[PDB]
Amino acid sequence: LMQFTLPVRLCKEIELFHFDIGPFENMWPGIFVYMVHRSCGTSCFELEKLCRFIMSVKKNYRRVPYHNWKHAVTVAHCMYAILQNNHTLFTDLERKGLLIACLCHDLDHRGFSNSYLQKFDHPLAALYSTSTMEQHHFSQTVSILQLEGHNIFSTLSSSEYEQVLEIIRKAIIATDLALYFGNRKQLEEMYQTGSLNLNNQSHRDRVIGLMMTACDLCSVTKLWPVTKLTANDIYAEFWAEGDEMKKLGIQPIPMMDRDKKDEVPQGQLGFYNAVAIPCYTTLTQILPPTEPLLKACRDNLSQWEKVIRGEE
Ligand SMILES: Cc1cnc(C)n2nc(CCc3nc(N4CCCC4=O)cn3C)nc12
Ligand SMILES: [Mg+2]
Ligand SMILES: [Zn+2]
C-alpha cells in the first residue's frame, strides 16, 4: 500500500521533540499523515477520509499571527514525539484521538482570549461561560467529523467512537491554560505521595491534560531562533487584543499592552518560571522520556536571561 515518506532530513528530525515543521504550508498535511501512520498505523484511518478531514480542518483555521494552521500542526508534532517516546503507555484509541485533538484544538480561533470575548460580550461567551474558545474548538471538531465523507472514526463501535470523542473533548478543554495550574498541582501531589495511578481513568485524564499543555506551549522547547521568532507571533496577537481592550475603554494587562514591548524579556522569564518549566518538570517525572522538552525549555530560559543581561 501507500506509505507517506519524507526527505531524509525531515524523516530523521521529525522524531526529535525540537523539530520545526518549516515554512512550506503544502507539506504540513503530508507531515501529519506521516505522523498518524507511524504513531497509530496505516490502518487507523481511511486515507481519502483522513485527507478530506485534514483539508476541512485547515480551512477552519484563520489567518491570525499565532493561533493558525501552523500552530495546529506544530502542536500535533509535539504529541507525536511524546507518543513515539512512550510506545507502550497509550491505548489504541488514545493514539487515534490525541493527534486529532492536537490538530483540532484551536479550530476557528479568532486571535482573542476567553477574557476578551467576555468583556466584548461575544455570543460565544453566553453559549459557553468557561473555557469559551475551547468549547468552541471542540464544537467545530464535531461539526467537521459530521460532514459527508469526513467520518475518520466510522469503523469504531458506538462505545469506542463515544470514548474517542470524550478523549478529544477532554484534551481540547485541557488546553485552556486557566485550568492547567490546578491540574499540574494535583498531578504534582499525586506523583509525590505515590497515589498516581495510570489505570485510574481520572488520573490518565489529568496526565493527558498535562501532555496537551506541554504540546500547546512547545514553542518554548524549540531551537532558540524558532522560540524567539514564534514569540513575536504570540505577542502580535496579544497586542492586537490589547488594542481591542483599549477600544472598549479597558486598560489591558501588561502582557497585551504593546506600550510595554521593552519588558518582553522579563515577561518571558515570569512565564518560563510560572508556567513552562513547572509544566515540563511534572511531565518529565510522570513520563521520563519527555525530558528533552524540559532540557530545551531550560535552554531557552537561559537565552531570555542572556537577553536581559544584554549579552544577546
Ligand atoms: C500562552 C503563551 C505561550 N507561549 C509563550 C512563549 N507565551 N509567552 C506569553 C506571554 C508571557 C508574558 N509576557 C508578559 N509581558 C510582556 C511585557 C509585559 C508583560 O507582562 C507577561 N507574560 C505572562 N504567553 C505565552
Ligand atoms: Mg487554545
Ligand atoms: Zn493552541
Side-chain angles (χ1 to χ4, degrees):
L1 259 170
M2 281 185 288
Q3 290 313 315
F4 274 79
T5 62
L6 304 177
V8 169
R9 193 194 56 88
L10 281 77
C11 179
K12 293 182 173 154
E13 270 148 69
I14 196 170
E15 295 307 320
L16 311 185
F17 286 95
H18 61 271
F19 183 61
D20 175 88
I21 61 167
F24 305 99
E25 291 207 344
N26 293 153
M27 281 178 87
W28 299 343
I31 284 172
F32 191 74
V33 169
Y34 180 86
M35 287 190 299
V36 172
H37 281 176
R38 284 185 91 260
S39 70
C40 198
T42 53
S43 42
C44 284
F45 307 118
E46 195 216 301
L47 193 37
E48 186 183 276
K49 277 165 184 298
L50 177 59
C51 287
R52 210 163 24 236
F53 180 88
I54 287 165
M55 297 310 294
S56 308
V57 177
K58 165 182 151 74
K59 189 205 300 129
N60 281 278
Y61 277 92
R62 303 199 167 215
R63 297 203 231 69
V64 289
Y66 177 69
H67 290 107
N68 50 45
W69 172 233
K70 189 177 200 176
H71 172 69
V73 175
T74 291
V75 171
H77 162 265
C78 193
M79 181 64 73
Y80 166 81
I82 294 174
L83 289 178
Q84 289 305 256
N85 280 273
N86 302 263
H87 177 67
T88 66
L89 281 211
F90 296 100
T91 69
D92 311 38
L93 282 181
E94 290 167 350
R95 268 188 265 86
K96 277 182 174 141
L98 291 171
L99 292 165
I100 301 296
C102 286
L103 194 69
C104 293
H105 80 285
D106 274 326
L107 259 167
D108 190 37
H109 207 289
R110 329 292 184 103
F112 299 108
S113 65
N114 289 334
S115 151
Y116 175 79
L117 260 70
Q118 300 144 26
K119 268 152 181 128
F120 181 84
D121 203 357
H122 194 279
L124 289 172
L127 176 46
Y128 312 119
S129 36
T130 63
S131 296
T132 306
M133 288 297 323
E134 293 79 21
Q135 303 195 57
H136 183 57
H137 311 306
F138 178 68
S139 170
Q140 295 276 291
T141 305
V142 177
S143 279
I144 293 182
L145 283 164
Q146 283 177 168
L147 300 169
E148 288 253 290
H150 293 51
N151 208 281
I152 61 173
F153 295 123
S154 67
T155 78
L156 304 186
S157 63
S158 316
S159 59
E160 292 197 316
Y161 188 96
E162 180 138 359
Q163 284 178 84
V164 84
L165 261 287
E166 195 68 357
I167 287 162
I168 291 152
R169 189 185 61 77
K170 290 173 189 148
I172 291 183
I173 298 312
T175 63
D176 179 3
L177 202 64
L179 293 175
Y180 147 71
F181 298 96
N183 186 56
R184 187 204 60 90
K185 280 158 208 130
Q186 291 297 123
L187 279 172
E188 209 203 338
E189 276 163 53
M190 277 167 212
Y191 172 71
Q192 281 165 18
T193 73
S195 29
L196 189 58
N197 176 25
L198 292 186
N199 302 323
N200 180 319
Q201 188 57 73
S202 87
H203 285 172
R204 291 183 84 65
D205 285 352
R206 299 196 161 275
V207 176
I208 291 163
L210 191 65
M211 286 160 58
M212 291 298 300
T213 303
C215 296
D216 203 11
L217 293 192
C218 78
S219 87
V220 307
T221 69
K222 303 308 186 183
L223 235 72
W224 167 241
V226 176
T227 301
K228 182 191 159 193
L229 290 168
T230 306
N232 298 330
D233 298 336
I234 291 172
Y235 284 110
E237 281 205 9
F238 289 163
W239 294 338
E241 178 176 325
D243 294 353
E244 289 307 323
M245 285 294 203
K246 288 171 191 170
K247 294 186 192 175
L248 291 173
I250 305 163
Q251 190 63 46
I253 63 173
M255 195 173 88
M256 298 187 177
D257 190 2
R258 56 183 76 252
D259 291 338
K260 319 194 145 166
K261 240 169 218 230
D262 294 348
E263 296 173 42
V264 156
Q266 195 65 57
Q268 286 297 301
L269 280 205
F271 183 83
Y272 278 68
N273 286 313
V275 178
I277 300 284
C279 174
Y280 297 107
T281 304
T282 305
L283 186 65
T284 289
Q285 293 174 179
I286 302 178
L287 293 182
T290 70
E291 199 195 327
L293 290 169
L294 173 52
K295 173 191 172 297
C297 183
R298 275 198 189 286
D299 285 341
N300 282 317
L301 164 55
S302 140
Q303 291 296 271
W304 287 112
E305 268 155 5
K306 281 179 170 169
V307 169
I308 276 139
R309 298 194 307 259
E311 296 162 32
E312 281 182 309

Short mmCIF file of all heavy atoms in Angstrom, two decimals, residues 198-252:
data_model
loop_
_atom_site.label_atom_id
_atom_site.label_comp_id
_atom_site.label_asym_id
_atom_site.label_seq_id
_atom_site.Cartn_x
_atom_site.Cartn_y
_atom_site.Cartn_z
N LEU A 198 -2.00 5.03 36.68
CA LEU A 198 -2.32 5.19 35.23
C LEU A 198 -3.49 4.26 34.84
O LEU A 198 -3.98 4.43 33.73
CB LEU A 198 -1.08 4.94 34.35
CG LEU A 198 0.05 5.98 34.43
CD1 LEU A 198 1.14 5.68 33.40
CD2 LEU A 198 -0.46 7.40 34.23
N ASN A 199 -3.96 3.36 35.70
CA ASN A 199 -5.17 2.55 35.41
C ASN A 199 -6.40 3.28 35.93
O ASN A 199 -7.50 2.83 35.71
CB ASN A 199 -5.11 1.14 36.01
CG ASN A 199 -3.89 0.42 35.49
OD1 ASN A 199 -3.54 0.59 34.32
ND2 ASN A 199 -3.20 -0.28 36.37
N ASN A 200 -6.19 4.37 36.64
CA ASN A 200 -7.30 5.22 37.11
C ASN A 200 -7.63 6.19 35.98
O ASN A 200 -6.80 7.10 35.67
CB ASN A 200 -6.93 5.85 38.45
CG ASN A 200 -8.04 6.74 38.98
OD1 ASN A 200 -8.69 7.49 38.25
ND2 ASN A 200 -8.26 6.68 40.27
N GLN A 201 -8.81 6.03 35.39
CA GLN A 201 -9.25 6.87 34.25
C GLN A 201 -9.11 8.36 34.58
O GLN A 201 -8.64 9.11 33.72
CB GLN A 201 -10.67 6.53 33.83
CG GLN A 201 -11.06 7.23 32.53
CD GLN A 201 -10.16 6.95 31.35
OE1 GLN A 201 -10.18 5.86 30.78
NE2 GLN A 201 -9.39 7.95 30.91
N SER A 202 -9.52 8.82 35.75
CA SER A 202 -9.50 10.26 36.06
C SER A 202 -8.03 10.71 36.24
O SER A 202 -7.72 11.92 36.04
CB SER A 202 -10.39 10.54 37.22
OG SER A 202 -9.67 10.37 38.41
N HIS A 203 -7.12 9.78 36.53
CA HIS A 203 -5.66 10.07 36.56
C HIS A 203 -5.15 10.21 35.12
O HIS A 203 -4.38 11.14 34.90
CB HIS A 203 -4.85 9.02 37.35
CG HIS A 203 -5.01 9.15 38.83
ND1 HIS A 203 -4.51 8.22 39.73
CD2 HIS A 203 -5.67 10.06 39.58
CE1 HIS A 203 -4.83 8.57 40.95
NE2 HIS A 203 -5.54 9.69 40.88
N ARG A 204 -5.48 9.27 34.24
CA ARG A 204 -4.99 9.32 32.85
C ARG A 204 -5.44 10.66 32.25
O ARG A 204 -4.68 11.27 31.44
CB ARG A 204 -5.56 8.21 31.99
CG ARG A 204 -5.04 6.84 32.35
CD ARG A 204 -5.63 5.84 31.38
NE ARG A 204 -4.89 5.76 30.13
CZ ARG A 204 -3.64 5.31 30.04
NH1 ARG A 204 -3.00 4.93 31.12
NH2 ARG A 204 -3.02 5.28 28.88
N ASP A 205 -6.66 11.04 32.58
CA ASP A 205 -7.30 12.28 32.07
C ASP A 205 -6.36 13.42 32.42
O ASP A 205 -6.02 14.26 31.55
CB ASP A 205 -8.71 12.49 32.65
CG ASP A 205 -9.77 11.57 32.06
OD1 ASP A 205 -9.49 10.85 31.08
OD2 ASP A 205 -10.89 11.57 32.59
N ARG A 206 -5.92 13.48 33.68
CA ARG A 206 -5.08 14.61 34.14
C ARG A 206 -3.75 14.60 33.35
O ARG A 206 -3.36 15.66 32.90
CB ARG A 206 -4.90 14.56 35.66
CG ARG A 206 -6.20 14.67 36.43
CD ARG A 206 -5.83 15.00 37.89
NE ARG A 206 -6.87 15.57 38.74
CZ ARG A 206 -7.21 16.85 38.82
NH1 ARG A 206 -6.63 17.78 38.08
NH2 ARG A 206 -8.15 17.21 39.68
N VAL A 207 -3.11 13.44 33.24
CA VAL A 207 -1.79 13.19 32.55
C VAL A 207 -1.92 13.61 31.07
O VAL A 207 -1.01 14.31 30.59
CB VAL A 207 -1.33 11.71 32.63
CG1 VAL A 207 -0.07 11.50 31.84
CG2 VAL A 207 -1.07 11.27 34.06
N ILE A 208 -3.04 13.27 30.42
CA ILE A 208 -3.31 13.69 29.01
C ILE A 208 -3.55 15.21 28.96
O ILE A 208 -2.98 15.88 28.06
CB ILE A 208 -4.48 12.90 28.41
CG1 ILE A 208 -4.11 11.43 28.20
CG2 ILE A 208 -5.01 13.58 27.16
CD1 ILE A 208 -5.32 10.53 28.02
N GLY A 209 -4.20 15.77 29.96
CA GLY A 209 -4.34 17.23 30.06
C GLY A 209 -2.98 17.90 30.11
O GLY A 209 -2.77 18.90 29.39
N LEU A 210 -2.06 17.39 30.91
CA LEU A 210 -0.71 17.99 31.01
C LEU A 210 0.07 17.84 29.69
O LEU A 210 0.79 18.74 29.34
CB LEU A 210 0.06 17.39 32.21
CG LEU A 210 1.34 18.15 32.55
CD1 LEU A 210 1.08 19.56 33.04
CD2 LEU A 210 2.14 17.36 33.58
N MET A 211 0.01 16.69 29.04
CA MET A 211 0.57 16.47 27.69
C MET A 211 0.04 17.54 26.74
O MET A 211 0.86 18.10 26.01
CB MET A 211 0.20 15.07 27.19
CG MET A 211 1.02 13.98 27.90
SD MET A 211 0.26 12.38 27.76
CE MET A 211 0.15 12.14 26.00
N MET A 212 -1.27 17.84 26.81
CA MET A 212 -1.92 18.84 25.95
C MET A 212 -1.32 20.21 26.22
O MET A 212 -0.90 20.86 25.20
CB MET A 212 -3.45 18.85 26.09
CG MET A 212 -4.05 17.59 25.52
SD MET A 212 -3.77 17.32 23.73
CE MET A 212 -4.55 18.81 23.10
N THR A 213 -1.13 20.59 27.49
CA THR A 213 -0.47 21.86 27.83
C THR A 213 0.97 21.85 27.28
O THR A 213 1.38 22.87 26.74
CB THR A 213 -0.45 22.08 29.35
OG1 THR A 213 -1.75 22.06 29.92
CG2 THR A 213 0.20 23.41 29.66
N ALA A 214 1.73 20.77 27.50
CA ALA A 214 3.14 20.63 27.08
C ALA A 214 3.22 20.83 25.56
O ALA A 214 4.08 21.59 25.07
CB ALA A 214 3.69 19.27 27.49
N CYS A 215 2.35 20.17 24.82
CA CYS A 215 2.34 20.31 23.34
C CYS A 215 1.94 21.74 22.96
O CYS A 215 2.55 22.35 22.07
CB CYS A 215 1.42 19.29 22.72
SG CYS A 215 1.95 17.57 22.97
N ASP A 216 0.93 22.28 23.61
CA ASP A 216 0.43 23.62 23.25
C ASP A 216 1.52 24.67 23.47
O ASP A 216 1.50 25.66 22.72
CB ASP A 216 -0.80 23.89 24.07
CG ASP A 216 -1.71 24.93 23.48
OD1 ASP A 216 -1.52 25.33 22.30
OD2 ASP A 216 -2.63 25.27 24.20
N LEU A 217 2.38 24.53 24.48
CA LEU A 217 3.40 25.54 24.86
C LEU A 217 4.72 25.26 24.13
O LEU A 217 5.64 25.95 24.42
CB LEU A 217 3.63 25.48 26.39
CG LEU A 217 2.47 25.93 27.27
CD1 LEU A 217 2.91 26.09 28.70
CD2 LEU A 217 1.88 27.23 26.76
N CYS A 218 4.78 24.30 23.21
CA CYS A 218 6.03 23.65 22.75
C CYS A 218 6.93 24.64 21.99
O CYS A 218 8.07 24.29 21.75
CB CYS A 218 5.73 22.39 21.93
SG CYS A 218 5.20 22.72 20.22
N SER A 219 6.49 25.87 21.69
CA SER A 219 7.40 26.86 21.07
C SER A 219 8.59 27.15 22.01
O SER A 219 9.67 27.50 21.51
CB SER A 219 6.70 28.16 20.70
OG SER A 219 6.70 29.04 21.81
N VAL A 220 8.40 27.02 23.33
CA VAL A 220 9.49 27.24 24.33
C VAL A 220 10.47 26.04 24.35
O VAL A 220 11.46 26.13 25.09
CB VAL A 220 8.88 27.54 25.71
CG1 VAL A 220 7.88 28.70 25.63
CG2 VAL A 220 8.26 26.32 26.37
N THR A 221 10.28 25.00 23.55
CA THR A 221 11.12 23.77 23.56
C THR A 221 11.89 23.65 22.25
O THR A 221 12.52 22.58 22.00
CB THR A 221 10.29 22.51 23.85
OG1 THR A 221 9.43 22.23 22.73
CG2 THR A 221 9.53 22.63 25.15
N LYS A 222 11.81 24.69 21.41
CA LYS A 222 12.45 24.66 20.07
C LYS A 222 13.86 25.24 20.19
O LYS A 222 14.19 25.76 21.22
CB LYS A 222 11.62 25.43 19.05
CG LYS A 222 10.17 24.93 18.89
CD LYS A 222 10.06 23.45 18.65
CE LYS A 222 8.63 23.01 18.35
NZ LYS A 222 8.56 21.54 18.20
N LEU A 223 14.62 25.16 19.11
CA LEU A 223 15.90 25.89 18.96
C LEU A 223 15.62 27.35 19.21
O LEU A 223 14.56 27.86 18.76
CB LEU A 223 16.39 25.74 17.51
CG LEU A 223 17.79 25.18 17.28
CD1 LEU A 223 17.79 23.68 17.59
CD2 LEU A 223 18.23 25.50 15.83
N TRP A 224 16.58 28.04 19.81
CA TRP A 224 16.38 29.45 20.21
C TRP A 224 15.85 30.31 19.05
O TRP A 224 14.89 31.04 19.23
CB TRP A 224 17.67 29.98 20.83
CG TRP A 224 17.68 31.46 20.99
CD1 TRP A 224 18.57 32.32 20.42
CD2 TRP A 224 16.82 32.25 21.84
NE1 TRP A 224 18.33 33.61 20.85
CE2 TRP A 224 17.26 33.59 21.72
CE3 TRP A 224 15.72 31.98 22.66
CZ2 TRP A 224 16.64 34.64 22.38
CZ3 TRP A 224 15.12 33.02 23.35
CH2 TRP A 224 15.55 34.33 23.17
N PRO A 225 16.38 30.27 17.81
CA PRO A 225 15.85 31.15 16.75
C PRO A 225 14.36 30.92 16.46
O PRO A 225 13.63 31.86 16.22
CB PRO A 225 16.71 30.79 15.54
CG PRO A 225 18.00 30.24 16.15
CD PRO A 225 17.53 29.46 17.36
N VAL A 226 13.90 29.68 16.55
CA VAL A 226 12.44 29.34 16.42
C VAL A 226 11.66 29.94 17.59
O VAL A 226 10.64 30.63 17.36
CB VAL A 226 12.20 27.82 16.30
CG1 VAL A 226 10.72 27.53 16.27
CG2 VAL A 226 12.92 27.23 15.09
N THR A 227 12.10 29.69 18.81
CA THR A 227 11.48 30.21 20.05
C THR A 227 11.29 31.73 19.98
O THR A 227 10.16 32.23 20.17
CB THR A 227 12.31 29.74 21.24
OG1 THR A 227 12.31 28.31 21.17
CG2 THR A 227 11.77 30.29 22.54
N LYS A 228 12.35 32.42 19.62
CA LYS A 228 12.41 33.90 19.61
C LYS A 228 11.44 34.44 18.55
O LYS A 228 10.67 35.35 18.88
CB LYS A 228 13.88 34.28 19.43
CG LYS A 228 14.16 35.77 19.43
CD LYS A 228 15.57 36.12 19.01
CE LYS A 228 15.65 37.56 18.53
NZ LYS A 228 16.91 37.87 17.82
N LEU A 229 11.40 33.86 17.35
CA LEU A 229 10.56 34.34 16.23
C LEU A 229 9.11 33.93 16.48
O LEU A 229 8.21 34.76 16.29
CB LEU A 229 11.10 33.76 14.93
CG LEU A 229 12.45 34.36 14.51
CD1 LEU A 229 13.08 33.56 13.41
CD2 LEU A 229 12.30 35.81 14.05
N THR A 230 8.85 32.74 17.01
CA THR A 230 7.47 32.40 17.45
C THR A 230 6.95 33.41 18.49
O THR A 230 5.77 33.84 18.37
CB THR A 230 7.32 30.97 17.96
OG1 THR A 230 7.83 30.09 16.97
CG2 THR A 230 5.90 30.60 18.26
N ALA A 231 7.78 33.88 19.44
CA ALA A 231 7.36 34.84 20.49
C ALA A 231 6.76 36.09 19.85
O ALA A 231 5.76 36.60 20.38
CB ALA A 231 8.53 35.27 21.34
N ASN A 232 7.39 36.57 18.78
CA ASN A 232 6.91 37.76 18.02
C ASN A 232 5.47 37.51 17.51
O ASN A 232 4.68 38.47 17.53
CB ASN A 232 7.74 38.10 16.79
CG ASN A 232 9.19 38.47 17.06
OD1 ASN A 232 9.55 39.00 18.11
ND2 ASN A 232 10.00 38.22 16.06
N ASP A 233 5.16 36.31 17.01
CA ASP A 233 3.78 35.97 16.56
C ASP A 233 2.82 35.97 17.75
O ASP A 233 1.68 36.52 17.61
CB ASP A 233 3.71 34.65 15.82
CG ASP A 233 4.54 34.64 14.54
OD1 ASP A 233 4.80 35.67 13.97
OD2 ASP A 233 4.98 33.60 14.19
N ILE A 234 3.26 35.38 18.87
CA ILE A 234 2.47 35.30 20.13
C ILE A 234 2.13 36.73 20.55
O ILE A 234 0.96 37.04 20.71
CB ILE A 234 3.22 34.52 21.22
CG1 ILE A 234 3.30 33.05 20.83
CG2 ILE A 234 2.55 34.70 22.57
CD1 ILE A 234 4.19 32.24 21.72
N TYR A 235 3.10 37.61 20.56
CA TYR A 235 2.84 39.00 21.03
C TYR A 235 2.03 39.79 20.00
O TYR A 235 1.29 40.70 20.39
CB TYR A 235 4.15 39.69 21.47
CG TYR A 235 4.67 39.25 22.82
CD1 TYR A 235 5.82 38.49 22.95
CD2 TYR A 235 3.99 39.56 23.98
CE1 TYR A 235 6.31 38.10 24.19
CE2 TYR A 235 4.44 39.17 25.23
CZ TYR A 235 5.60 38.42 25.33
OH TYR A 235 6.00 38.00 26.57
N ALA A 236 2.15 39.50 18.71
CA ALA A 236 1.42 40.23 17.67
C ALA A 236 -0.06 40.04 17.95
O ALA A 236 -0.80 41.07 17.94
CB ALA A 236 1.86 39.82 16.27
N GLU A 237 -0.48 38.84 18.34
CA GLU A 237 -1.87 38.58 18.75
C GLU A 237 -2.22 39.35 20.02
O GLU A 237 -3.27 40.07 20.04
CB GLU A 237 -2.13 37.09 19.00
CG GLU A 237 -2.33 36.32 17.74
CD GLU A 237 -3.14 35.03 17.81
OE1 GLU A 237 -3.79 34.69 18.87
OE2 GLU A 237 -3.11 34.38 16.77
N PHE A 238 -1.42 39.18 21.07
CA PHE A 238 -1.71 39.75 22.41
C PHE A 238 -1.91 41.25 22.29
O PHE A 238 -2.88 41.77 22.85
CB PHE A 238 -0.61 39.41 23.42
CG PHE A 238 -0.58 37.96 23.84
CD1 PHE A 238 0.53 37.42 24.45
CD2 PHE A 238 -1.72 37.17 23.77
CE1 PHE A 238 0.52 36.12 24.94
CE2 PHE A 238 -1.72 35.87 24.25
CZ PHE A 238 -0.60 35.33 24.81
N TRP A 239 -1.03 41.91 21.55
CA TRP A 239 -1.03 43.39 21.42
C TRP A 239 -2.23 43.87 20.57
O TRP A 239 -2.79 44.97 20.86
CB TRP A 239 0.29 43.80 20.83
CG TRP A 239 1.44 43.53 21.75
CD1 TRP A 239 1.43 43.37 23.10
CD2 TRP A 239 2.82 43.53 21.36
NE1 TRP A 239 2.69 43.17 23.58
CE2 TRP A 239 3.56 43.29 22.53
CE3 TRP A 239 3.47 43.64 20.13
CZ2 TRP A 239 4.94 43.17 22.49
CZ3 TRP A 239 4.83 43.47 20.09
CH2 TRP A 239 5.55 43.28 21.26
N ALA A 240 -2.63 43.10 19.57
CA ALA A 240 -3.89 43.41 18.85
C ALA A 240 -5.06 43.30 19.84
O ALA A 240 -5.97 44.16 19.81
CB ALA A 240 -4.07 42.51 17.67
N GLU A 241 -5.08 42.31 20.73
CA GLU A 241 -6.18 42.21 21.73
C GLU A 241 -6.08 43.42 22.67
O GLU A 241 -7.11 43.97 23.09
CB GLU A 241 -6.11 40.86 22.42
CG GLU A 241 -7.16 40.69 23.50
CD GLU A 241 -7.20 39.33 24.15
OE1 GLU A 241 -6.93 38.31 23.44
OE2 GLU A 241 -7.51 39.29 25.35
N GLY A 242 -4.86 43.78 23.07
CA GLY A 242 -4.61 44.98 23.89
C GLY A 242 -5.28 46.18 23.27
O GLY A 242 -5.96 46.95 24.01
N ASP A 243 -5.06 46.36 21.97
CA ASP A 243 -5.66 47.50 21.21
C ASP A 243 -7.19 47.42 21.38
O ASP A 243 -7.80 48.47 21.67
CB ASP A 243 -5.26 47.46 19.74
CG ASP A 243 -3.78 47.68 19.46
OD1 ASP A 243 -3.05 48.00 20.43
OD2 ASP A 243 -3.39 47.55 18.27
N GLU A 244 -7.76 46.23 21.19
CA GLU A 244 -9.23 46.00 21.23
C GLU A 244 -9.76 46.23 22.65
O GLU A 244 -10.90 46.74 22.79
CB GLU A 244 -9.57 44.61 20.72
CG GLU A 244 -9.38 44.45 19.21
CD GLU A 244 -10.11 45.50 18.36
OE1 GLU A 244 -11.21 45.86 18.74
OE2 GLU A 244 -9.54 45.99 17.34
N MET A 245 -8.95 45.92 23.66
CA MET A 245 -9.27 46.24 25.08
C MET A 245 -9.31 47.77 25.21
O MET A 245 -10.30 48.29 25.81
CB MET A 245 -8.23 45.63 26.04
CG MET A 245 -8.36 44.15 26.22
SD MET A 245 -9.90 43.66 27.05
CE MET A 245 -9.43 42.06 27.72
N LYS A 246 -8.35 48.48 24.62
CA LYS A 246 -8.34 49.96 24.77
C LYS A 246 -9.56 50.55 24.06
O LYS A 246 -10.11 51.51 24.61
CB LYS A 246 -7.05 50.57 24.24
CG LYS A 246 -5.87 50.29 25.12
CD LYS A 246 -4.56 50.69 24.52
CE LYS A 246 -3.44 50.13 25.35
NZ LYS A 246 -2.14 50.30 24.67
N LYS A 247 -10.02 49.96 22.96
CA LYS A 247 -11.25 50.40 22.25
C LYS A 247 -12.50 50.18 23.10
O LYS A 247 -13.39 50.98 23.01
CB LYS A 247 -11.38 49.67 20.92
CG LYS A 247 -10.32 50.03 19.89
CD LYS A 247 -10.62 49.36 18.55
CE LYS A 247 -9.45 49.47 17.61
NZ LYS A 247 -9.75 48.70 16.38
N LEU A 248 -12.55 49.15 23.93
CA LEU A 248 -13.65 49.02 24.91
C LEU A 248 -13.43 49.94 26.12
O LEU A 248 -14.23 49.84 27.01
CB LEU A 248 -13.71 47.58 25.38
CG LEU A 248 -14.19 46.60 24.31
CD1 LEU A 248 -14.06 45.15 24.82
CD2 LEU A 248 -15.62 46.93 23.92
N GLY A 249 -12.37 50.75 26.15
CA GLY A 249 -12.05 51.65 27.27
C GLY A 249 -11.58 50.87 28.50
O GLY A 249 -11.96 51.24 29.58
N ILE A 250 -10.83 49.78 28.31
CA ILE A 250 -10.27 48.90 29.38
C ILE A 250 -8.74 48.88 29.20
O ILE A 250 -8.25 48.68 28.06
CB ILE A 250 -10.86 47.47 29.35
CG1 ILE A 250 -12.38 47.46 29.42
CG2 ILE A 250 -10.26 46.59 30.46
CD1 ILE A 250 -13.00 46.17 29.01
N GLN A 251 -7.99 49.18 30.24
CA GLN A 251 -6.52 49.04 30.24
C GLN A 251 -6.24 47.55 30.07
O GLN A 251 -6.74 46.75 30.84
CB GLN A 251 -5.90 49.51 31.56
CG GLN A 251 -4.38 49.61 31.51
CD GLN A 251 -3.95 50.65 30.51
OE1 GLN A 251 -4.49 51.75 30.46
NE2 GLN A 251 -3.00 50.30 29.65
N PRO A 252 -5.50 47.11 29.06
CA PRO A 252 -5.15 45.69 29.00
C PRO A 252 -4.16 45.34 30.12
O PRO A 252 -3.40 46.19 30.49
CB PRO A 252 -4.46 45.54 27.64
CG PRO A 252 -3.96 46.91 27.32
CD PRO A 252 -4.93 47.90 27.96
#
